[PDB]
Amino acid sequence: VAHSAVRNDPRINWLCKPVHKHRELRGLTSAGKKFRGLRGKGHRHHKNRPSRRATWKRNQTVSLRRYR
Amino acid sequence: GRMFAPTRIWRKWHRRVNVRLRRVAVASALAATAVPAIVTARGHRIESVPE
Amino acid sequence: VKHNNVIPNGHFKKHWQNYVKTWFNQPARKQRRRIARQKKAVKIFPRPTSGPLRPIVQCQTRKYNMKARAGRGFTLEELKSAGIPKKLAPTIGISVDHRRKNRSLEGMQSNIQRLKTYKAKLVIFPRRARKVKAGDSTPEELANATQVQGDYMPIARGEKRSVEVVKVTEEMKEFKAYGKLRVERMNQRQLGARQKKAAEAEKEE
Amino acid sequence: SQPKSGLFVGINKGHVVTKRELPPRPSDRKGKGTKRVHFVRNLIREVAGFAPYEKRITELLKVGKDKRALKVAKRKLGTHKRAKKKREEMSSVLRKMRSA
RNA sequence: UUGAAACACGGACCAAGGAGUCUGACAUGCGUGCGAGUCGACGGGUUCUGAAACCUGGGAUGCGCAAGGAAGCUGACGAGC
RNA sequence: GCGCGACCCCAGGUCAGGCGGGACUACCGCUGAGUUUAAGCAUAUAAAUAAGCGGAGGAGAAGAAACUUACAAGGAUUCCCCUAGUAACGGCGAGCGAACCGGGAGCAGCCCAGCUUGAGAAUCGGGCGGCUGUGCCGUCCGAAUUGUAGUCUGGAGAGGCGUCCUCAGCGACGGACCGGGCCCAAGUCCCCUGGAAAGGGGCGCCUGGGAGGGUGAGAGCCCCGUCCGGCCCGGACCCUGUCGCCCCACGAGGCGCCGUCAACGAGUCGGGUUGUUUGGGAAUGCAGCCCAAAUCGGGCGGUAGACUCCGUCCAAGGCUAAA
Ligand SMILES: [Mg+2]
Ligand SMILES: [Mg+2]
Ligand SMILES: [Mg+2]
Ligand SMILES: [Mg+2]
Ligand SMILES: [Mg+2]
Ligand SMILES: [Mg+2]
Ligand SMILES: [Mg+2]
Ligand SMILES: [Mg+2]
Ligand SMILES: [Mg+2]
Ligand SMILES: [Mg+2]
Ligand SMILES: [Mg+2]
Ligand SMILES: [Mg+2]
Ligand SMILES: [Mg+2]
Ligand SMILES: [Mg+2]
Ligand SMILES: [Mg+2]
Ligand SMILES: [Mg+2]
Ligand SMILES: [Mg+2]
Ligand SMILES: [Mg+2]
Ligand SMILES: [Mg+2]
Ligand SMILES: [Mg+2]
Ligand SMILES: [Mg+2]
Numbered sequence: 001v002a003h004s005a006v007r008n009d010p011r012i013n014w015l016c017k018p019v020h021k022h023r024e025l026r027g028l029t030s031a032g033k034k035f036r037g038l039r040g041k042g043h044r045h046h047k048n049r050p051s052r053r054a055t056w057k058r059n060q061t062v063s064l065r066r067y068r
Numbered sequence: 069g070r071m072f073a074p075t076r077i078w079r080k081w082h083r084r085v086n087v088r089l090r091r092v093a094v095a096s097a098l099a100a101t102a103v104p105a106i107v108t109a110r111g112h113r114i115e116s117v118p119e
Numbered sequence: 120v121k122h123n124n125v126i127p128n129g130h131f132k133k134h135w136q137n138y139v140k141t142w143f144n145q146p147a148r149k150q151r152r153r154i155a156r157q158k159k160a161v162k163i164f165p166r167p168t169s170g171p172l173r174p175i176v177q178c179q180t181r182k183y184n185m186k187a188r189a190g191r192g193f194t195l196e197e198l199k200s201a202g203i204p205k206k207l208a209p210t211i212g213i214s215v216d217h218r219r220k221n222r223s224l225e226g227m228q229s230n231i232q233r234l235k236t237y238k239a240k241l242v243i244f245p246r247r248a249r250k251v252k253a254g255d256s257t258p259e260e261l262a263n264a265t266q267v268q269g270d271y272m273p274i275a276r277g278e279k280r281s282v283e284v285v286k287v288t289e290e291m292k293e294f295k296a297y298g299k300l301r302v303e304r305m306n307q308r309q310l311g312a313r314q315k316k317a318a319e320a321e322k323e324e
Numbered sequence: 325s326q327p328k329s330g331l332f333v334g335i336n337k338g339h340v341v342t343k344r345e346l347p348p349r350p351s352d353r354k355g356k357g358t359k360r361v362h363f364v365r366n367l368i369r370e371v372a373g374f375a376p377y378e379k380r381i382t383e384l385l386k387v388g389k390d391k392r393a394l395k396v397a398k399r400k401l402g403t404h405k406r407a408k409k410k411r412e413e414m415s416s417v418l419r420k421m422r423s424a
Numbered sequence: 425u426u427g428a429a430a431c432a433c434g435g436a437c438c439a440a441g442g443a444g445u446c447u448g449a450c451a452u453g454c455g456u457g458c459g460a461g462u463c464g465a466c467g468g469g470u471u472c473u474g475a476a477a478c479c480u481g482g483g484a485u486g487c488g489c490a491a492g493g494a495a496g497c498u499g500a501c502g503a504g505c
Numbered sequence: 506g507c508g509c510g511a512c513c514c515c516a517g518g519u520c521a522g523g524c525g526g527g528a529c530u531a532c533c534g535c536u537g538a539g540u541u542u543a544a545g546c547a548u549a550u551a552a553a554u555a556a557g558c559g560g561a562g563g564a565g566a567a568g569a570a571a572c573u574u575a576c577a578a579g580g581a582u583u584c585c586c587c588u589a590g591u592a593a594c595g596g597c598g599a600g601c602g603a604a605c606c607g608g609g610a611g612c613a614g615c616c617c618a619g620c621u622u623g624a625g626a627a628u629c630g631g632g633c634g635g636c637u638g639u640g641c642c643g644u645c646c647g648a649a650u651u652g653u654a655g656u657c658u659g660g661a662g663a664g665g666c667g668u669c670c671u672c673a674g675c676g677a678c679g680g681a682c683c684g685g686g687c688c689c690a691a692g693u694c695c696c697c698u699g700g701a702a703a704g705g706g707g708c709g710c711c712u713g714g715g716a717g718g719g720u721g722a723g724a725g726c727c728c729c730g731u732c733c734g735g736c737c738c739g740g741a742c743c744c745u746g747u748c749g750c751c752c753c754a755c756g757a758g759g760c761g762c763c764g765u766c767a768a769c770g771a772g773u774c775g776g777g778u779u780g781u782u783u784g785g786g787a788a789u790g791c792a793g794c795c796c797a798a799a800u801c802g803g804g805c806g807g808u809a810g811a812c813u814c815c816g817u818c819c820a821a822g823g824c825u826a827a828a
Contacts, residue, residue: 002523005630005648011616014824018562025560026533030822036534037790039820041581042572043604043807044789050567050583051533052782052790056553059603060138063585064447066145066475067084067465073445078139080447087464089457090478125450128590130601132542132551139447146475149467152610152828159827161681162744170612177577180606184339184576186483188607191580195660196347204759205660207671209613217660218570218580223327224342226577246672250752253670276483303334308496310335325815328577339577350659351769354819355802358768360620362800377797399796402776404811406798413799 165266171214172237174230175274186277192216193230200227201234211243233272381414386422 001007001016014020023029027036037048047055100106107114120127160168174197176190192214198205208215213234221227242264245255328338374382377400384393393414398407 003630008629011823019565020561022560025535026566027535027560028533028566032534034821035791038567040572040790041570042805044785044805046604047783048567048790050565052553053534054532054566055603057138058584060133060135061140062135062138062448063140063142064078065142065465065586066082068080069442072443076446077143078141078447084463084465086457086462088462092457094478123451127449128600129449130590131448132600134551134554136447137554143475148610150475152467153469155611155828158682164745176579178607179574179576179579181576183607184578186607187577191612202760206759214612215660216580220346220578220580222344222346223577224344226341227344247753248748252672252753278483280483299331300333303331304497307334338575341577350661350767351819352659353767354659354769355800356767357800357802359766361768365800375797399777401798402796403798406775409799409802 160266160268163266165264166212167267167271169268169270171209171212172233172272173214173274174233175226176219177226187274188276189274190216190219192219193234194219194221194227196221197227197230197234200231201238203234203238211241213237237272378410378414381411382418385411385415385418 006012007016020028024032026032033039037045037052049055104114156168172193173189173191174193175187177184178186178188193208194216195205198208198213198215203211203213205215242256242260243254244261244264245251325343326336327340327343329336330340331337377396381393381397384396390411394407394411397410397414398404401407401410
């Protein structure tokens, strides 16, 4: 992503942005999308989106509203 | 040491009143504004006011 | 545990105090969204602040199929019947939904009329100063144009209550409403046994 | 289908509304085999050959053992739906060869 | 503690700190408002000391207004002493 | 007595470049307990948590249905309310526990691979030179035919025909948002007390300014400030508001018909078995190993199975704001 023949290709510029550093170590390649349960959409996969731990945190939260 | 039962931000700070009970109380307050004896008793100097 | 009370079932055995969500930022949320809406309104002026046009759909699931609500977007057939090209609609303020279907004629007719109703009261500025191409408008029209706000095409959720008066006729009084329901339930449950006895007829008879 | 009966119970229960016909969609040809793809896939078959289980299946189809041809296919491929189809495919290959 | 002046334990003295609280669910009682209804609690609008106040939605959100059945299902024809 | 060309490897302090480490609020991946509860305890619970190992950004992740539903059906992702302490799961014990529908916040969809330049690699990098300089131009080397560009992505599309209908940019001034510096009302009048008047009494004044602070005791008027605004300097901006010149096309796109074609991701899906995980129960996801596909075909319709029908979607590649 330092090669100029890459930086001038519109279809692959996305890989030069800082948000794509070490995609494989964060589970964001095709294999990563597989073992993260993201190949599938409905029930049978709903707990994996945004992430299994993000889903768990949301279900753990105690929401104490002002007027309750 | 730490205090007994340390205060937490999830105390119940704000309490709810029924929409209708709020309106009833405003009505009572408005009426009392029209009674000279009560406006006097609440501490307002109303002694040269015409009406 | 003691005296006649309800069986206690509170789910407080984890580290729940680490995931307490309080709402002290609720008034600030309203203000940020208001500023966001207000800032968005200027950057889209004169386009309406409610957004693009949404079609009428019936809700799913028995409990709600008698109620109409806004759907994602118009189908391709609704767009083509009203003569709005596929790739022009989002550019003029009309959402599209390449996924929705038209199984019942009345729904398709209703949403077609919205597109003409929208097209009737839609005005479009030219892409440059003086050139007037297809679909543009008269200068008089473009001065009378303001940023409409709110719901410029409201959706009535369902059928208005009407209690008419008619005459109760002899056929009406003879009709057995309960008898009809029980015989129609009967047919449903005998459907297999009837079809099987029929089916075995052509197998043997 | 014909719309519902207008009654809350029974066969075709539900709310009457004019049913309509939906034009073919792309992917209503999804899976339809096509010429050049089949040309390529046939050609590879002679170049590549047959898998050992595909060889075993035809042998029993050649004896006449339709059941075991299916039963071997199933333990290999996994499901009755695929095993049924692969047996028919082997039977087809068998009828384009032993015809002459 | 059955029994303490106890050959039962703690206490040299003084100052300051020091222990039934907060939260969620439910229940009875009491107070307030409305009442076959009742909640505006997620939002929206508006608001110039106010993160307040005030308006709005609900034609079906919660609870109540109907129950018995495992279920398929059926669902209170009007009280006398 | 050779010199070839390519293949796969060398070594270079070769030209030019990019890598590692740091911080913990929130985010992504892995790994992973026990205290505790069950009035004992082992499944269970604590917990898919703490600790451990890594990876990011200003947000991250997710995202455009191989989705739900069974309805007059709906239609990407995320978040809130409700569903709901519910269906389910559980020494069916202690306990645990989602999703669909519905209502809101915010809404946006895109791009590849493959049959399809063959009269022609039309593509791209680098050195060098020049200029208007985040780039463009010339030229020489090289990458690449074991495939760069263009078309095309199922919602389609390639073709064919056709009245038609649609397309080029730079100026000039600004408005907004961003930072900064300055300027801005009126008593320190008379007596008393006091070390000190900012206290008391008298007489006055400002107030779109009686927020706050300082000054020798409760100061609107002593000073800085506050209200209303005025001014001068500097930015980033890529958003739109108007005046100026330039006039978009035989290319592409839309739309009307046609029916001839119509290509769509493989040790992957899918099945078995093992372990883990889940509310997921003849098996929710994931992972090991074994078997191992199809193209009137494939994945689903929350009880395993065979057949007939029906609804539904199209995986195995990628990007994508906002709430
Ligand atoms: Mg004793
Ligand atoms: Mg003694
Ligand atoms: Mg003792
Ligand atoms: Mg002692
Ligand atoms: Mg004390
Ligand atoms: Mg109600
Ligand atoms: Mg693990
Ligand atoms: Mg604990
Ligand atoms: Mg224990
Ligand atoms: Mg214990
Ligand atoms: Mg023990
Ligand atoms: Mg940790
Ligand atoms: Mg992202
Ligand atoms: Mg409830
Ligand atoms: Mg758990
Ligand atoms: Mg001053
Ligand atoms: Mg004085
Ligand atoms: Mg002061
Ligand atoms: Mg001043
Ligand atoms: Mg499993
Ligand atoms: Mg992504």
